[PDB]
Write a protein that binds this DNA or RNA. Structure first.
Ligand SMILES: [Ca+2]
Ligand SMILES: [Ca+2]
Length: 117
RNA sequence: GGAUGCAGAGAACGAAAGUUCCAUGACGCAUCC
C-alpha cells in the first residue's frame, strides 16, 4: 500500500542520510517506537519498508504522518532499514527523531519528498 | 499460559558443541485473569 513511488536516487539519498544521522542524531527502528514517535510529535522523518508481509503492519503509518505533518518515505527493503541504529536487525519502519548535524540535508530531502505530492 | 501498560536489545538452557525465540518487539518489570 504505497501512497507514492519514490525514485531510486531519492531512496538512496534518504538511506544514506540515515547512516550519516546515526552518529550526531537520534534514530528509532521498528513499528512500535516509530508509531509512538509520530504520535508524540517527535519524528523528524519516517522510513517505511516496501516488502512488509502482511503489509497491514505498516499501513497505518502514512495517514498518521499526514495527521501529524510528518514526512514519510518508502524504502525498498526492510534490510536496508536494519542498519538504522544499534543491533543489525531488519526493520519494517524507522524514524529519524533528531536531524542532528545534517540539518540542510534533511531539509532538501523533505523538499524533494513534498515534491512528490 | 492469557489480557493490559512502561521501556526498547539481544534473551533463555547449556561447561560448550549447540538448540530455541527477537524491532512483524523477544527478554524483561509491574497490574489483573
Ligand atoms: Ca548474548
Ligand atoms: Ca551459562
Amino acid at each position: 500500500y504505497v501512497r507514492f513511488e519514490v525514485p531510486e536516487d531519492m531512496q538512496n539519498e534518504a538511506l544514506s542520510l540515515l547512516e550519516k544521522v546515526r552518529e550526531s542524531g537520534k534514530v528509532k527502528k521498528g513499528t512500535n517506537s516509530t508509531t509512538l514517535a509520530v504520535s508524540r510529535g517527535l519524528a523528524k522523518l519516517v522510513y517505511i519498508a516496501e516488502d512488509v508481509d502482511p503489509p497491514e503492519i505498516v499501513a497505518h503509518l502514512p495517514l498518521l504522518c499526514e495527521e501529524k505533518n510528518v514526512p514519510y518515505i518508502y524504502v525498498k527493503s526492510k534490510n536496508d532499514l536494519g542498519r538504522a541504529v544499534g543491533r543489525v536487525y531488519p526493520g519494517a519502519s524507522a524514524a529519524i527523531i533528531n536531524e542532528g548535524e545534517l540539518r540542510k540535508e534533511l531539509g532538501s530531502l523533505v523538499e524533494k519528498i513534498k515534491g512528490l505530492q
